[PDB]
Design a protein around this ligand. Structure first.
Ligand SMILES: COc1cc(OC)cc(N(CCNC(C)C)c2ccc3ncc(-c4cnn(C)c4)nc3c2)c1
Length: 291
């Protein structure tokens, strides 16, 4: 069965399962309340998210969920990632307990804050979003983690507006990706892939920087859809031609230069996440919150 790990084990009777938050093919996430998740106070409840298998899950799906939990244990904690908090592994179904991000994914967060046809985001708020995501990615890269699907849909937002990278440990067989498979919202994930990842199946920290450039474009378009109406075969042609997305409106030349630099054709020439954090820290400090 599953091996005991006292560093992370939470007794099942401490976890009160709640409403669904999200679902995949053979995995599901629910909101829950953990009683005494911390050794002191044992009388406090914490809202958490719990990932578990679907009822039609196979041995391979269980292996995949364990692999993701094990990677999260190894990577350790950071403010700008969804952190592992505990697990229920004994005498019942596997529950992987992680931080809850009440405001949901970044794509929906941005779209809900567009001016009418919560409150509007300032230019400083948008650059701060980009900075926090770059900080989470710099941490993951420092821990030898390659995300492989960095996009606003995979960034969650907490109640205190903290950006947290999600699904960085997700089991993924890159030789069995269906390029035609659309996301829940009807978009194609290939549109965030670096050309070397898409054409040659080569995933690196450099290919995650390319994806971060697409994510910057999503931020400054307030959750815009990259290449709307472009099918897989036409996207391949655009990438082969060296096509680059246009500058969004209300985006500085400097932040557009940053997107373009993330999209360098030569992977070695793209900025690193360390470089992006430093530049975004400087830009945040110089960006007005007055509009
Ligand atoms: C490392 O990141 C992980 C690890 C993990 O288990 C090991 C599960 C999650 N998930 C699934 C994440 N999938 C998507 C595709 C990004 C969470 C985690 C915390 C969550 N908090 C809030 C909400 C929420 C709020 N509003 N709405 C509509 C949904 N959804 C959550 C989903 C994230």
């Amino acid at each position: 069965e599953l091996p005991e790990d006292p560093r992370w084990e939470l007794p099942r009777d401490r976890l009160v399962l709640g409403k669904p938050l999200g679902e995949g093919a053979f995995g599901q996430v629910v909101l829950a309340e953990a009683i005494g998740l911390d050794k002191d106070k044992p009388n406090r409840v914490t809202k958490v998210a719990v990932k578990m298998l679907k009822s039609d899950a196979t041995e391979k799906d269980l292996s995949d969920l364990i692999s993701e939990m094990e990677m999260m244990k190894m990577i350790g904690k950071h403010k700008n990632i969804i952190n592992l908090l505990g697990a229920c592994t004994q005498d019942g179904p596997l529950y992987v307990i992680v931080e809850y991000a009440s405001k949901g994914n970044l794509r929906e967060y941005l779209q809900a804050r567009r001016p009418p046809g919560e409150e509007q985001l300032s230019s400083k708020d948008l650059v701060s979003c980009a900075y926090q995501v770059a900080r989470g990615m710099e941490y993951l890269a420092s821990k030898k983690c390659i995300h492989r699907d960095l996009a606003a849909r995979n960034v969650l937002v907490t109640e205190d507006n903290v950006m947290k990278i999600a699904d960085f440990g997700l089991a993924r067989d890159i030789h069995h990706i269906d390029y035609y498979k659309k996301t829940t919202n009807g978009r194609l994930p290939v549109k965030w892939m670096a050309p070397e990842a898409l054409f040659d199946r080569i995933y690196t920290h450099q290919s995650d920087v390319w994806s971060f450039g697409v994510l910057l474009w999503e931020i400054f378009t307030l959750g815009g859809s990259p290449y709307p109406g472009v099918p897989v075969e036409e996207l391949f042609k655009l990438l082969k031609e060296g096509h680059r997305m246009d500058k969004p409106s209300n985006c500085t030349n400097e932040l557009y230069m940053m997107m373009r630099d993330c999209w360098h054709a030569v992977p070695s020439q793209r900025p690193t996440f360390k470089q992006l954090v430093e530049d975004l820290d400087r830009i945040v400090a110089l960006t007005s919150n007055q509009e």
